[PDB]
């Protein structure tokens, strides 16, 4: 991908392709998961997970949502 600033997401103070908004559940601290569509779910998720020192259990939930952003239902929909 080598495009211009179409609809890039600003997480805290940096801009990325698409970032997810992550609440652990407690209203704080609020996390965001920056994703670049050229990268893998597990890798993007792991990168944020290791960076924020999250539990590797979250890796699946973040990566799968990352996938949804490039998959049907969420992005491709697929509604007859």
UniProtKB/Swiss-Prot annotation:
Residues 1-80 form the PFU domain. It comes from the Eukaryota. Induction: Up-regulated by tumor necrosis factor alpha (TNF-alpha) (at protein level). It is found in: Nucleus; Cytoplasm; Synapse. Plays a role in protein ubiquitination, sorting and degradation through its association with VCP. Involved in ubiquitin-mediated membrane proteins trafficking to late endosomes in an ESCRT-dependent manner, and hence plays a role in synaptic vesicle recycling. May play a role in macroautophagy, regulating for instance the clearance of damaged lysosomes. Plays a role in cerebellar Purkinje cell development. The PUL domain is composed of 6 armadillo-like repeats and mediates the interaction with VCP C-terminus. The PFU domain mediates interaction with ubiquitin. Belongs to the WD repeat PLAP family. It is linked to Neurodevelopmental disorder with progressive microcephaly, spasticity, and brain anomalies: An autosomal recessive neurodevelopmental disorder characterized by progressive microcephaly, spastic quadriparesis, global developmental delay, profound intellectual disability and severely impaired or absent motor function. More variable features include seizures and optic atrophy. Interacts with ubiquitin. Interacts with UBXN6, VCP and YOD1; may form a complex involved in macroautophagy. This is Phospholipase A-2-activating protein. The gene is PLAA.
